[PDB]
Symmetry: D2
Subunit: 378 residues, 4 copies
């Protein structure tokens, strides 16, 4: 009764490979040119990586070297896994300055595109993130954690996890269903896999107080999982946008993050929307907070700002919407200054979630105390 489900994928999933390659290229460019315009779309298939899009930068980068290193760190170094970073093909289809100061104050620059973006936060977890997506992320990051340190050496990078939570009036009741399918080598059978996944992955993550005898567990439910990654499966950037955000707990505007420089409101505004939502919840102004911002191309001011507090607000929501508008610069290049986004920090974001990890700029809660006593509280 009253259940919610969220899924996640590891860094070896072909979609996440394309996300990591895109942001890897972005980080390389930003390391030389912080003001660069980057729109990098990566296509990864069996034996192939296609890196395309449009960049406008003074930087000079090696797309092949960046791509091979990124796949090499993911762990695809051998043809027995279905993909090898040293022998795969790397093709490039990157165009330059698309024929487009304009503004006396750079912060007043209009948006580069239209679109809608969402941010979310909930005091369910320590990191102000929804439980299902948080623990789904932690399962697949542990699977890579135990593959990379040699604990379970038979694991291969491609993996997917899914956690179904039972809810009762916003109260986290427990876990009703766990799904975890991981790619593996020939050095293990399915019965030893289902037991090793329980002991080395699921147990050090899902709190024992949420697992009962009724919790359905599906570990490699179809059996053998040896062929994976780009082998026999396509990977495109921007095909895991719900995994990259809130696992379905919150709504989405449709924009991908990876391969996009901070001037692309699809990424920066979504990070800022998370920044507002986390600070509103961290300030104690709501238990759950979702905000939507939208933009029109060539318009600096957001065309709409909605603050949704699902009955959890500790102050009228009209007051919340005004607090958002004055304590945060939601203008495109205002986001960049507010979050200090012109740095090569994005290859790390393309993997196990863009949110919930406290060292990102959009995850710091330096505005919570300000919002708290600005709304007159304690």
């Amino acid at each position: 009764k009253h259940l919610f489900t969220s899924e996640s994928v590891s860094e070896g999933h072909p979609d996440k490979i394309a996300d990591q390659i895109s942001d890897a290229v972005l980080d390389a460019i930003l390391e030389q040119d912080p003001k660069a315009r980057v729109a990098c779309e990566t296509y990864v298939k069996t034996g192939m990586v296609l890196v395309g899009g449009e960049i406008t930068t003074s930087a000079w980068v090696d797309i092949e070297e960046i791509t091979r290193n990124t796949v090499r760190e993911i762990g695809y170094v051998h043809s027995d896994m279905g993909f090898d970073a040293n022998s795969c093909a790397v093709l490039s289809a990157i165009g330059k300055q698309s024929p487009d100061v304009d503004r006396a104050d750079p912060l007043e620059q209009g948006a580069g595109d239209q679109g809608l973006m969402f941010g979310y936060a909930t005091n369910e977890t320590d990191v102000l993130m929804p439980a299902p997506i948080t623990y789904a992320h932690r399962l697949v990051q542990r699977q890579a954690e135990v593959r990379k340190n040699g604990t379970l050496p038979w694991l291969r990078p491609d993996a997917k996890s899914q956690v179904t939570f039972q809810y009762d009036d916003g109260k986290i009741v427990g876990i009703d269903a766990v799904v975890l399918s991981t790619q593996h080598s020939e050095e293990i059978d399915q019965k030893s896999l289902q037991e090793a996944v329980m002991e080395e992955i699921i147990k050090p993550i899902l709190p024992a107080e949420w697992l009962t005898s009724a919790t359905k567990f599906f570990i490699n439910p179809t059996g053998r999982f040896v062929i994976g990654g780009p082998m026999g499966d396509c990977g495109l950037t921007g095909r895991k946008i719900i995994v990259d955000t809130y696992g379905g707990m919150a709504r989405h505007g449709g924009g991908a993050f990876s391969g996009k420089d901070p001037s692309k409101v699809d990424r920066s505004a979504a990070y800022a929307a998370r920044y507002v939502a986390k600070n509103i919840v961290a300030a104690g102004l709501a238990d759950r907070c979702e905000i939507q911002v939208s933009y029109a191309i060539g318009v600096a001011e957001p065309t709409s700002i909605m603050v949704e507090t699902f009955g959890t607000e500790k102050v009228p929501s009209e007051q919340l919407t005004l607090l958002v508008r004055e304590f945060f610069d939601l203008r495109p290049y205002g986001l960049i200054q507010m979050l200090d986004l012109l740095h090569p920090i994005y290859k790390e974001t393309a993997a196990y979630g863009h949110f919930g990890r406290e060292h990102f700029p959009w995850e710091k809660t330096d505005k919570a105390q300000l919002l708290r006593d600005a709304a007159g509280l304690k």
Copy 2:
């Protein structure tokens, strides 16, 4: 009071070109082989279309002809438009991906995943107003482009509508954005007036248009370079304009290029089918259905019914009626909606949800649901 905003793109938008090419390949395979497994990802860039993925089927089909015909119908037929269906490159990287149930209806889900369905009586088609009219703006744009009413504009186009709600009720439209590609023969002033008279005003109801409504028509000026040139399009990059424009939640699954055995597409269609029939039955004003699946499991791992307080009958009675009247098993909803037919290129532009001629948009269960509930 609050504002909500949704967007849509024309059939000429690069991401939507990829979606249509992926479903055009799908339709041509289903026409010969209705039980085909197809997972077709399309990548469109300046001068080329890359059609890839995994396909296992007994159908023989010409990817080049399908791709060229699709782009041709979309409208890119000249180098002056930035893309030409008769001279672009078409590369294929399609592979063949490498009998368990006595009843095919009991087959387990091909993959895990969560899907959402939504419905709301804001509009006649039981869809959210922002996404609905965002679709009708870009669809009207293509309409007046193809019938020669405005011959000077080009396929690539984007729309965005900002609605104002007073706690569930539509009060009007706050902001309208329409950006359309065009040729050199037209100036921006005559362009703005033409899309205001032929595109915007015939689509948005005059009751929602006030003097405070903002109209952004080609806000940055000339829009000559468009489509696959200057940008880049990939299948499944418009999943929110495909569904409910952000009004409802989304599981993360793309639609185009996937046969009905993929729960990412099929279960979302079914989730819309149940949500729409619930709202059409008067059981709720707004309704969101969440379905979750586990790979190898036929029964959904979760079925959530959220009615946002608009529940006209008890919520437990709603979740029960969903299980009674709807078969949400992977191959059960294929038979419930008759999905093994080439009918998917139509869905790849202007929204998968909202057009009553689709199987998941039929309300043939509405009177049944209303009877089993009371009145």
Copy 3:
């Protein structure tokens, strides 16, 4: 004094890989549709095979399956060699009927393109082929022979050989220089390689009566040769046309063979030119014979026929040119009937030479006795 040199490459050379893939696709199509028009150009790079061109056929073929099988038979099945047929990328860019009975007698059809083609034959060897290219071919085919039967298991497919012959008035004097560079594994050093190449490759091919103490031998002259094949080296069809023919001993028209159906005069006319030249020499009418034919598009009769007998003719060369014109149908679709070319026999030709192997139709000498007593001899 008076030296001549010719080179050859093995079936693992990236250029020969593209030739084999092209003809493999051609054979597959001809096996279903003998009348098919095929123009298949293959591009093979690290981790990638691109198969393009124009085909017009009722056949339905699997380009990916044909490509992987062809590379699999060549021996690239592992990423340690630099290329794997199971995990590489296969892309296709094949167009259909390019918008082009026409003739009451099909044999009178005009040529599909212009161009020039050469054929050659010399009684130096048993197979009426020049010695240098023949023995250069035999060296690299032996290298694959000893790699495939497990004799020298450390060999990798990519290999190149080159033989310099000393001549004295057409008399084969001996061998002055041998070059043989073969790709190898880590299971051998360079000194053991240079000795094993001598014992297992060079010795059972080059006759001992042609090797002196002055014969320069260059076996892996640069040393270690571990990275090869498509890895770090491009391969295109039609980039080994001199290896495919007479090793430079004879002239060439410029046309590639592989991937072209027999209606393409670049291939069929060259095979027929070899057919004429071999029969002229086999009939005893000349010791060395080179013929050139040329075509104009839409013209059935060759625009020119030259019979060059380098002072070796046993009958006036004017008479030879007339004998050629009446004992051979050099019209495009006359070649096809004369040589019975509408069969899938071409994947075998894309490797160690299109000539010199007696089981090919253009290599049979069923017209020699006819030419001999037609010119009035014995």
Copy 4:
């Protein structure tokens, strides 16, 4: 009596587009880095250009801009022509391939291979007549295309000339083939007359044109679809039209896309340099030079001089003079011909041999060779 035939293609022929793109990339790298190692293979097809190979250089260069500029200068700038430099796809698959001699001139050959050079006093440029005038026909075609004399014809074009010889002496021209791409505005009759008056007659000497000369002008009719569309072009697929049109033998090495350290290109240029100076010195009427190289060896493994009986001095004296006056070592002929300069896009169409403004076409050794021989 005998007939000999050679062919040539225009700068718009698909194989030649690939050769020019490969050398345009080469020229732009040499302009910044003269000692760069580049091996650039280009693949042109309907709507796309794939530029691949192995390159190690300190130069930063824009493959897209170089490719688009090259095709643009070639003439494909509209979809009606079948290819457009401003909207085609440009993919790059270039890698970096993964200090031994005290004197750089003593470096060993980067690869094995045999190369041929040729020269004959049949023409003023000391080239075989069939290939020479085959080049001048397609070059005249582009000439009258670009200066607006005939604006209706398009870049793709092929020529072929059949010469008749009476044992070494030119007697005339037997057959002329000229096929040129064109637009729809022109009919085949007016096309045949126009290329006869503006292309063929201004190029082929009237002494060689009789009433028995065959003229095949667009022999199959309309030639509208051309260039990369309908066909397919690869670097190094025109090695015989690049050199001597079949009159001389060929080693098998392609030219375009290769820096001067590649003996396939460099030694062939040098072999032409020696053959031309020998013929220009009056030492022979026809001369063919064969040079062979072993990888890692600086001295050529073979140097053959064939004069076809036209030797005006003893043949042993000729082979000696070649070794005395020419440095045929891999990096020796780079310095002998000053090859480390961006001068190679010019060679990628209309013949590498024949145009006196190239380094390997200079006859600065002719008087020297004649002195050291006698007179």
